[PDB]
Amino acid sequence: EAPWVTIVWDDPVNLMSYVTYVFQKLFGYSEPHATKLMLQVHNEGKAVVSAGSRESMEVDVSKLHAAGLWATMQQDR
């Protein structure tokens, strides 16, 4: 019943510019939004990047994995 979130985890390989681009490409986010989330990943170690049903977050995780980003999902409490 609960809503879920997709989290992207910091990784030591992917370019900062790539991560900003992926968030725009996969989610349609604006450049300031994508950059903000990228920097949160890089400076906090992780960031919630999207939110919704468990099934919707399963798709976001799969899309992010195909892009090569470290994504997981968990219930939002």
Ligand SMILES: CC(C)C[C@H](N)C(=O)N[C@H](C(=O)O)[C@@H](C)O
């Ligand atoms: C947003 C995260 C994944 C950035 C990386 N931790 C990072 O430091 N990337 C570097 C960079 O963009 O210069 C190199 C390692 O790709």
Ligand SMILES: [Mg+2]
């Ligand atoms: Mg929460």
Ligand code: NI
């Ligand atoms: Ni880094």
